[PDB]
Design a protein around this ligand. Structure first.
Ligand SMILES: Nc1ncnc2c1ncn2[C@@H]1O[C@H](COP(=O)(O)OP(=O)(O)O)[C@@H](O)[C@H]1O
Ligand SMILES: Nc1ncnc2c1ncn2[C@@H]1O[C@H](COP(=O)(O)OP(=O)(O)O)[C@@H](O)[C@H]1O
Ligand SMILES: Nc1ncnc2c1ncn2[C@@H]1O[C@H](COP(=O)(O)OP(=O)(O)O)[C@@H](O)[C@H]1O
Ligand SMILES: [Mg+2]
Ligand SMILES: [Mg+2]
Ligand SMILES: [Mg+2]
Lengths: 149, 149, 149
């Protein structure tokens, strides 16, 4: 089944919102298949956020993401990449739909709760960057027969 | 006052979200006026969803809706039909607004949690199809003085 | 730091939705810095809602806002006026996004749960009108370093 990379950022961690973010992912029908609380080393931060090296927020992003643990996830489900982006909401929490993770819990664009892969291509890159395959489980669940034709 | 027919589908029943969906309806201010847990007969499913007869998903539609019990409901309030459609959200859960029942809880279009009548006339037909009048109660909520001018 | 005036209306008070409304404000990141349960004198209502004096709904507005107590608040945070309106949703709960306070909890345009100031000008006006400076507390919170760069 399709997989994406999700990551609860240090603002949500330091706000004691880990369970609440997870609940939103779970209740959507997405399956957690990889999951670890970890500190992000500088090298990992930078390769993760490589595409943004040009920009004025870059230094502040790298600092932020490396300032306290994140909860990194691999998440499975039909159309999982676009589904997750949909529930996460716009990069800017003031544009994100109410009801979305960022919309409900994020205040500013730079501190916006959670990351999700932006495409299949960047899902497979990020999943490989953050996880080894031995860290990723595969398992059938009761509700699987009810989520899918 | 205006009434609509809502039905918590088998996916939400088998995922144990009955209470959660009812709560979404109740806090919107809609009044539950009829409700029963029931298995859907083949004949009722087919007449209820007859407008979809030769669409590719129809056989799946009919097998799903008959596969386990549903929670059938008559709900009352000003503009109940549209108000209900609005908190249910789009047919496809990944189009449905975050914060809507389908946006938050459904994963795929085939398994989208809850049904609501799509028009005033389809509400009266579906209400009549699913309930006899002696199944529909009549009562004043203390809250009404405050939902309306 | 930018601040705005939010007011939980007698309909949410009379449906016992006070904590639930306050929770959506808090979890967005907004900091409650002033707050008080109070009956609204007629003159306070009239000056707060003076703009609408001509309109056909004005008399209903005044009677409604004075029918039971309200919860008056001053809330603080970056872009607080717009951020507040965003989570609150459109005046009409039927056009407000699912997931917003008005979309999930309101039923009609006149019984729509909460007020927020509509610009920086009206924020300062409403805060001054409803509160004295000595009822508005100023304080560092733990989360602050995680909401903002
Ligand atoms: N204008 C900005 N100011 C500060 N930080 C930003 C800005 N734009 C993006 N960021 C940070 O960079 C992260 C990645 O940006 P981008 O990849 O465009 O969005 P997304 O995280 O939604 O995929 C954002 O989630 C955010 O934390
Ligand atoms: N493209 C599709 N693939 C699978 N199932 C579908 C599809 N379109 C509709 N359905 C199913 O048929 C039901 C009724 O369809 P429709 O009347 O168009 O939507 P709604 O239920 O939003 O009014 C939907 O609730 C869904 O269960
Ligand atoms: N057509 C209407 N009918 C009844 N009440 C209305 C109407 N329009 C506005 N109101 C009431 O007056 C309040 C103030 O109106 P307005 O400033 O237009 O909206 P908002 O409160 O979203 O800033 C609304 O929250 C609502 O309680
Ligand atoms: Mg991106
Ligand atoms: Mg339809
Ligand atoms: Mg206004």
């Amino acid at each position: 089944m399709e997989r994406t990379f999700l990551m609860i950022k240090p603002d949500a961690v330091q706000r004691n919102l880990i369970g609440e973010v997870i609940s939103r992912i779970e209740r959507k029908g997405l399956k957690l298949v990889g999951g670890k609380l970890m500190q992000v080393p500088m090298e990992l931060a930078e390769t993760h956020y490589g595409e943004h090296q040009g920009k004025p927020f870059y230094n502040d992003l790298i600092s932020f993401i490396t300032s306290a643990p994140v909860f990194a996830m691999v998440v499975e489900g039909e159309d999982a990449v676009n589904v997750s982006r949909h529930i996460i909401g716009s990069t800017n929490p003031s544009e994100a739909s109410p009801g979305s993770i960022r919309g409900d819990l994020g205040l500013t664009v730079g501190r916006n709760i959670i990351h999700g892969s932006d495409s299949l291509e960047s899902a497979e890159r990020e999943i490989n960057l953050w996880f080894n395959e031995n860290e990723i489980t595969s398992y059938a669940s009761p509700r699987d027969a009810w989520l899918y034709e």
